[PDB]
Symmetry: C6
Subunit: 150 residues, 6 copies
C-alpha cells in the first residue's frame, strides 16, 4: 500500500505534466471539427485532477487509490484520443482520407486494450473465487482432520 503509493505517484506526475504541456503546445496550432477542444480540455481536467491527488497525499479507506487509478486511466485515454484528432486536423486542408484511416486502424487497438483489460479484471475476480474455493476446501479437510484428534 505504501511503496506503490509513493513510487507510482512519483513517476505518474511526470507523465501528467508532459501530457499537460505537450497537449498544451498541441492546442495553439492553426499553421471532428468543434468537439476537439472539448476532448482535449476534458483531458486537461482528468490529468490536472489526478495530479491534484498527487498533491493531496501527505497524510495518505482504499477508495482513494482506485480514484487515482481511474483518473490516470482516463488521462491516458483522452491523451491518445485527442492526439489521434491531431493527426486528424493536421491532414484536413491537404487530405481528408488519411485521418479517417488513422482512427480506423488505431481505435480498433483501443477496443483491443479494453478487451484484454476486462479479460484480466475477470481473471483477478475469478482466481479470487478459485483461491477462496480451494482454500475453503482445505479448511474443511482441516476441520475433519482436527475432529479426529479430539
Amino acid at each position: 500500500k505504501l511503496q506503490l503509493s509513493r513510487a507510482k505517484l512519483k513517476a505518474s506526475s511526470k507523465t501528467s505534466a508532459l501530457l499537460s504541456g505537450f497537449a498544451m503546445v498541441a492546442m495553439v496550432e492553426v499553421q471532428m471539427l468543434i468537439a476537439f477542444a472539448i476532448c482535449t480540455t476534458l483531458l486537461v481536467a482528468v490529468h490536472m485532477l489526478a495530479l491534484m491527488i498527487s498533491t493531496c497525499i501527505l497524510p495518505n479507506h482504499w477508495y482513494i487509490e482506485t480514484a487515482w487509478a481511474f483518473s490516470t486511466l482516463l488521462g491516458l485515454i483522452l491523451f491518445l484520443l485527442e492526439i489521434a484528432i491531431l493527426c486528424w486536423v493536421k491532414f484536413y486542408d491537404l487530405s481528408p482520407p488519411a485521418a479517417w484511416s488513422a482512427t480506423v486502424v488505431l481505435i480498433l487497438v483501443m477496443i483491443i486494450f479494453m478487451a484484454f483489460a476486462i479479460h484480466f479484471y475477470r481473471s483477478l475476480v475469478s482466481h479470487k473465487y478459485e483461491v477462496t474455493v480451494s482454500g475453503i476446501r482445505e479448511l474443511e479437510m482441516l476441520k475433519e482432520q482436527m475432529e479426529q484428534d479430539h
Copy 2:
C-alpha cells in the same frame, strides 16, 4: 510532516517548472478577451511561489506545508482555467461553438473538483466521527473496567 516533507516536496518542483515554461509557450500564439493574460500571469506567479517553497524548507509551524498544498491547488486550478481560456480565445474568432462547449464542460469540471473535494472532506468527518466516537466510548469502558476492581 517530515517524511511527507521529503516525499511530496521532492516531486512538486517538476510540476511547477513544466507548467511555468509550457505556460510560456502557451502565451505566445496569435499567428474572456482581455483578462486571459492576467489569469496566466498570476498563475505562473503562484507556481513561482511554490518553487520558492521548494527551496525554502531546508533546515526545518506546519501550516507552511498547507501553504504549499493549497497554493499548488491554485496552481493546477489556474492552469486548467487558463487553458480553458486558451481553447476560448484561440478558437473564438475562428469558431464559437468549440470554445463555448469547452467552457460548458470545464465549468462542469471545476464543479467536479469542488464537489468531490467537499465530498471527501465530509467523508473525513464521517469515519473520523465513527472511529473517534467508538474511541471515546472504549476509553469509558476502560474506566469502568478499572473501577470494577476497586
Copy 3:
C-alpha cells in the same frame, strides 16, 4: 520480475512521455504520403500503452512483465521509424535522394537489430543448452554414484 518491475517501470515513464509529446510537436508541422500521421499515432499510442502499464501494476499474472517489454520495444522501434518518416517528408519536395537514402539506411539498422537480436537469442540458446547439458550430466554421474551406496 519484482525489483526489475519497479526500476524499469520507474524509468520507462520518462521515455514514453518525452517521445510521446515530442512526436506531438512533430505532428503539427508542415512547414509515405497519407499514412504518416497514422504511423505516428500508433507510435505515441504504444508509448501511451507502456505508460498505462506503468500505472497498471497496482493489483499486479506474469506475462504482463514481458508485455511491458514489448510495449517499450515497439516504442523506440516505431519512434525511430516515424522520425525516419519525418526525414522522409522534410526532404521530399526539396530532394528525392536524401529521404530515400534516409529510410534505406535506417531499415538497415532495423536489420542490424533483428540480426543481433536473433544472434543473442541463439546465445541464450547456447547458455541454455550448455547449462542444461552439464546439469543433466552431473546429475547422471551423481545418480549412478549415488545408486552405488543404495
Copy 4:
C-alpha cells in the same frame, strides 16, 4: 548542513535548467519597451549562476551556502518579473490595459511576497531571541541550583 545538502541541492538543478531553457524559447516571440531584454537576460544570468553553484558543491560552509540561497531567491523574483514583462510585450499593439491590469493583479502579489517574507523573517529571528533567552535563564538557574550544593 549535510542532510540539507542532500535535500535542497538534489532538486535545485532540474528547476534551474528548465526555467533557463523555456525562458530561452520565451525570447523568440513577436507573433516597458527596451528594459525587457535586460530583465529577462539578467534573470537567465542569475539562474545560470545558481546552476554553477548547484554543480560546485563537490567537496561537501553556511557563508557560501547562504550566498547560493539569496542567489536562488533573487533568481525566482527575476523570473516572475520578466515573465510579467513577457505577457506585457507579447500583447502591446493589441491592448495596453490587459497587460496593465495584469500588473495591477501581480504587484499586489509582489508586496504579498515581501510582506509575508519579512513577517516570518522578523518573527523567526524573534523566536531565536526567545530560545536564546530561555537558554540563558535556565543555565543561570542551574548555576544557582549548583550553589545549593555548596
Copy 5:
C-alpha cells in the same frame, strides 16, 4: 562494473531521451545539403538503440556494458555533428560565412576531444599495464625469497 550498470542506466536515459526528442524539434525548423536529415535520424537510431539497451536489463554477455559505453559515445558525437549542421542550414540562405567559420573553430575541437579521449585510452592501457608489472615483479621477488625455504 555493476554500480555503473544500475546508476548510469538510471540517469543516462533521461538525457538520451531529451536529446532524441529535442533532435526531433531540431528537424522542423527552417522558419552538406541532403544527408543531414539522415544523419540526425540515424543519431536518434543510436540513442533509441541505447535506450533499447536501457530496457534490456531486466535480468541484467558482460560486454553489453561496453556496448552501452560506445553506443553512448557515438550518440553524443553524432548529436554535436548534426547540431553543427543545424547552425549551418538555418543560416544558409541568409548567411554563408557564420556557420562555415563555426565549423572552422569547432571541428578542430572534434579532433581535440577524440584526440584527448584516445590520449587517455593510451594512459589507461599504460597504467593498467604498470599495475600488472608491479604485481608480476613483486611476485618474482617474493617468489625467490619464499623459494629459498622450499
Copy 6:
C-alpha cells in the same frame, strides 16, 4: 571522489542535456552577427563533452572529474552567452540599444562571479596554508613531547 561520483554526477547531466536541446531551439531563429551560431554550437560541444565524461565511468583517471567540473561550468557560461546573443537579435531589426545595456550589465556580473570566486578561492588557499600552520605547531609540540621525553 566517491560521494561526488554519486552526488554531483547523478544530477548535473540532466541540466546539461536540457541546455543542449534548448540551445538547439535557440539556433533556429531569423526573426554580434556571424559568431552567434559559432557560440551556440561551441556551447553544444562543451555540454556534449560533460555528458561523455558522465558516461565514462563504466570501468571506474580522476583528473577527468576536474575536466567534468570545469566542463559543466563552461557549459553554463556558453549557454548564457548565446542566449544573450539571441536577446540581441530579437532586439536587432526593431531596436539596438536595449540588448546593449543588457549585455553591459551582464558581463559586469560575470566578472563579479569570477572576481569573488577567485577571491575566496584564495581564501581557500589561505585556510589550507593556515591549517598547515596550526598543524605544524601541534606537530612541533608533538616533536618535543616525542623525542624530548626519550
